[model samples]
Target: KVRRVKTIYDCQADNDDELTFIEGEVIIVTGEEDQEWWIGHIEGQPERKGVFPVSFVHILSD
Candidate 1:
């Protein structure tokens, strides 16, 4: 099981002004012990514990 990771949330909120998204978000939806991980890319399909490439990440400067 992955010892540590980040998480989105049960609700959608603003990412603040200068916050950025990165990988290693989750190991599972229920935070269960397993071999896979929930860390994924925004450009890819958002599965429970799937991974995606970061070649499509978009950043907007405000």
Candidate 2:
């Protein structure tokens, strides 16, 4: 199942492997390896996977 989340703060990618998103941008979480970081891509583009802080987004559904 795909998990959708909404960004709560503006996140600037610190490196090439990280994801950059603005507040309110929707993201599709592909992997949650731990509590601090997650793997996902911005909605509308599934080809690019990037790492982001888990605190940066709010889960939309259970």
Candidate 3:
């Protein structure tokens, strides 16, 4: 389940290939907020969740 949701830009994983993505994508924030590296799920891909930099996206507003 998505604890929180955030919209992302081109968040290509510099270290991990599993985290690479195109510019337009929606990421579900599923990890600790204070953590530098966060775990989230890319929209439409259930098993593709990975660690992403906090700088990649901002908090989603209601």
Best by lDDT: 2
For candidate 1, give the lDDT of residue 17.
19
Model 3 scores what on Cα lDDT?
Answer: 0.65
Regions of candidate 2 where Cα sits further than 4 Å from its true position: none
How big is the positional error of residue 54 in model 3, measured in Å on the Cα after superposition?
1.4
- Which residue pairs overlap in candidate 1's backbone? 26-38
Q: By lDDT, is 1 or 3 better?
A: 3
The 10-residue segment with the lowest total lDDT in model 1: 53-62
Global lDDT of each candidate: 0.30, 0.85, 0.65
TM-score: the better of candidates 1 and 3: 3
Query: CA lDDT of 39 in candidate 3?
Result: 78
Residue-by-residue lDDT tens digits, candidate 3, 1-62: 33555545676667653366665567776775456677778778867677777666666633
In model 3, where do residues sit more than 4 Å from their true spots?
Answer: 1-7, 16-18
- Candidate 1 residue 54 C-alpha distance from true site, Å: 0.7
